[PDB]
Amino acid sequence: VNELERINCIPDQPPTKATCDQRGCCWNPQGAVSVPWCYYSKNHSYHVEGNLVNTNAGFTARLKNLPSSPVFGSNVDNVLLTAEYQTSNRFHFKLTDQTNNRFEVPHEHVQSFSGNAAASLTYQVEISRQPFSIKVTRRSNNRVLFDSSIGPLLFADQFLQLSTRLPSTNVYGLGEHVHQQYRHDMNWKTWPIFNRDTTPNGNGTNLYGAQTFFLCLEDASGLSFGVFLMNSNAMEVVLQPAPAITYRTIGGILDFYVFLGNTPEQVVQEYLELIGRPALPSYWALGFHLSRYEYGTLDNMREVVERNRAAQLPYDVQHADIDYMDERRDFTYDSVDFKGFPEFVNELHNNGQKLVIIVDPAISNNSSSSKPYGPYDRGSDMKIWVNSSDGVTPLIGEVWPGQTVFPDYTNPNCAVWWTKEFELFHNQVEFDGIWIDMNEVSNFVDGSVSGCSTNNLNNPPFTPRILDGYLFCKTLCMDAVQHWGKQYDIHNLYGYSMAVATAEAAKTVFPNKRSFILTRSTFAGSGKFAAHWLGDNTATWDDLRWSIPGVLEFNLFGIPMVGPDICGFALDTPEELCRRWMQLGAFYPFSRNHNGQGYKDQDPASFGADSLLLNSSRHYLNIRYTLLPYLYTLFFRAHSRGDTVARPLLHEFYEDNSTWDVHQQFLWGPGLLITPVLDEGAEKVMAYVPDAVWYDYETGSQVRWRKQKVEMELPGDKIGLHLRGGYIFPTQQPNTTTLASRKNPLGLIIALDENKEAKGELFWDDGETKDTVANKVYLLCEFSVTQNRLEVNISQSTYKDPNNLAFNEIKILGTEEPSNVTVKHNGVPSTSPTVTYDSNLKVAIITDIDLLLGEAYTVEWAH
Ligand SMILES: *[C@@H]1O[C@H](CO)[C@@H](O[C@@H]2O[C@H](CO)[C@@H](O)[C@H](O)[C@H]2NC(C)=O)[C@H](O)[C@H]1NC(C)=O
Ligand SMILES: *[C@@H]1O[C@H](CO)[C@@H](O[C@H]2O[C@H](CO)[C@@H](O)[C@H](O)[C@H]2NC(C)=O)[C@H](O)[C@H]1NC(C)=O
Ligand SMILES: [O-]S([O-])([O-])O[C@@H](CO)[C@H](O)C[S@+]1C[C@@H](O)[C@H](O)[C@H]1CO
Ligand SMILES: *[C@@H]1O[C@H](CO)[C@@H](O)[C@H](O)[C@H]1NC(C)=O
């Protein structure tokens, strides 16, 4: 045995020979660090009994256990393998108890498969019988993608395990964690997954969400595949240098999906097709958001709002944290410190801004006849709470307002209660979106106010390496009871179910609008309902650096609208760190400056009306807003096709192995390269310039760099922004809110490639109505440039913006002097455009032009 292939047979304790012998494993302490001293033997697990049986969907096999006696609970003697050739690029297999029904995730989007095995498979599946293994290979080149033969299948009631070899160490995904790097280097590492309120720091613990998907770039040709495990039980994922990955879960079933694609982007598309593509956001939600924990008073909140508006900061959304509530209670505001809250919301709305309020799941149980609490009263009447293990008494915990009960969002009647609570609150306070927090679910006591009973759910035979080492730590008892089942099985689905419910609520509170939902806890598929933020970070340079892989990973997960708390939640932020964080933060898909209780102000204007931080912030936010039609079109593609929005370099440049672990840079879509300074004291960054033509966004000049590391010079007031040759970027003159910006002239930036060609597109709809894509009420155009000619082509035209919008400026990068510029509208010349040329920089700008949005044009020139 090569020691890098050993599968650890004592994951639970320090290795000893007595235990090894007792478990039938192999003993060989003579390895390197982390190499398992005790590991599974070549032949001792399951075997196929009899023949495989062809089915309409695929095949089944009966697997039978070669007798080994109880280690982590009751073992499953007879396992059923069910395999389905669901599509040409998606393989599904599950391992279940032949004789007993077990918990299976009640996912809201994923459906059971009916009908027939797909034609034209890109993959082939091979099963071995003695012992059992399953292998998925790519048909085109026979590359083995999934191969469980490296280790056993373990299948006990509370311990299920399967391993697979991997064809490369280009592995990305898993969550929710702070991985620090984007690529998993595959040296020995265990990642626990169990939704938990915990700090995203350098310790690598389980965090708020549960995301089992990973993507593997097989080679430089771009060929890639992905694996997803549909299991909501506590689990851990073990990486080793074979290279190989092992999934080790303490409940449910092994329900796997394998996705193949020609590019990493196609693997993401295949995954999102299964689990659900992200919601198209409200266009306003792409603006800058400002927030903090404890303004304390409305007067304080208004002062912050007003100084940032005074500074002309692009600034669409104000969040209001639990300090707006009457004693941290949902669906109230503090009639004293937040006296006049309704008038403030009118002021926000009148300035074209939006209000997002925090809502916690936990409901105060403190209600009397003297002092009634309506949400508790109504929730109790409807009987919609999570119950203790008796199945009838609501479970009591403790969160912000004190003792609380917790909504059971898995019960359809709960969402009716939840909706009515929001419709009543909204009559008082006209919020525009909802921030759901503390939904792991997070509890200030362990399990409940009376703790947890000792039993196999609260105290299982095996516990993954979760923070604090008990399942019920800072959450509900594992034997608590909900409509979908016991908390042991569905704990990881609480935040998911809460987002589903909250989205159901938005149907009523915000009729036919998308609104905005931001969630802390997530499961696979939560991006269909909500944005995400990366949680309670800290104002340190480490946190700044760690933000990028977090953003990228959530994009792979189909939650593209993601960002951290810009400047850092915990701690006073240093000015230089906040300045570099706001530069980068202008380019996070979800851009929010948020701050913890007590710390100094970190809103941009608090640094001074004439500070470099404010100046720089406003400069880069105005760039963000200029480019919002490009960003919005990227979200349209994420929603309708499944593309990422914040994208790793390797997704566009996989042919170049220098891009495979770049994590200090990223792209917006295919064309915009963002290079932040992420080091204290630095005025340069060490960056990689991929193999393309690149133009400096601000000046339009073509960089000398191509396919190389560079020291990019970036002074206190600069972040690197380069546009890729071959791409056309739609823009719109910025303003301080998107309500206003969306009325402005549009522009095109044409970044020419080596052949003087470029392509791009623009999606445009009303920016807020739900189902504009489903109901095909939108504009989609395509731009293409070939040497002497720009064509504006209209592929869908069922929305005409009433603001009479037009392209009034075209900037061409990397061009020789155009001359004789002519504009035609469906063939008819022409109106005679002004052209300015910079011969040194090779930039042409065409003005005094009026190309109506939604109309076909040709713009032609000579050299
Ligand atoms: C939690 O306990 C309550 C009782 O406290 C259960 O409420 C039942 O709800 C249905 C209507 O949905 C009624 O028909 C039953 O009569 C209720 N029970 C009683 C005795 O009041 C609720 O079902 C429990 N929840 C779970 C998930 O088991
Ligand atoms: C940005 O939006 C503001 C609204 O906040 C626009 O404000 C002005 O627009 C008109 C001038 O063309 C005035 O007649 C309005 O009264 C005025 N409103 C204000 C400032 O409160 C402004 O034009 C927009 N600017 C850009 C660059 O688009
Ligand atoms: O450390 S402390 O801030 O007190 O509490 C954290 C640990 O439980 C919570 O997650 C903070 S919550 C999440 C944070 O975005 C909100 O601003 C806080 C108030 O709603
Ligand atoms: C790990 O957690 C501890 C608290 O238990 C914290 O003080 C420490 O800073 C963390 N370590 C890292 C590497 O961030």
UniProtKB/Swiss-Prot annotation:
It is found in: Apical cell membrane. Changing D437A: Loss of alpha-1,4-glucosidase activity toward maltose. The modification Sulfotyrosine is found at Y324, Y333. Broadly expressed. Highly expressed in small intestine. Expressed in granulocytes. Disulfide bonds join C9-C25, C20-C38, C567-C578. Acarbose binds at D197, D321, R520, D536, H594. Residues 1-42 form the P-type domain. N- and O-glycosylated. Does not undergo intracellular or extracellular proteolytic cleavage. Alpha-(1,4) exo-glucosidase involved in breakdown of dietary starch oligosaccharides in small intestine. Cleaves the non-reducing alpha-(1,4)-linked glucose residue in linear dextrins with retention of anomeric center stereochemistry. Mainly hydrolyzes short length oligomaltoses having two to seven glucose residues. Can cleave alpha-(1,2), alpha-(1,3) and alpha-(1,6) glycosidic linkages with lower efficiency, whereas beta glycosidic linkages are usually not hydrolyzed. The displayed isoform 2 sequence is inferred based on alignments, homology, conservation, expression and longest protein. RNA-seq transcriptomic analysis supports all introns in a single sample. No single full-size mRNA sequence supports this isoform yet, however it is clearly identified by mass spectrometry analysis. The N-terminal maltase domain (ntMGAM) mainly hydrolyzes short length oligomaltoses having two to four glucose residues. The C-terminal glucoamylase domain (ctMGAM) acts on longer maltoside substrates having four to seven glucose residues. Belongs to the glycosyl hydrolase 31 family. Monomer. This is Maltase-glucoamylase. The gene is MGAM.
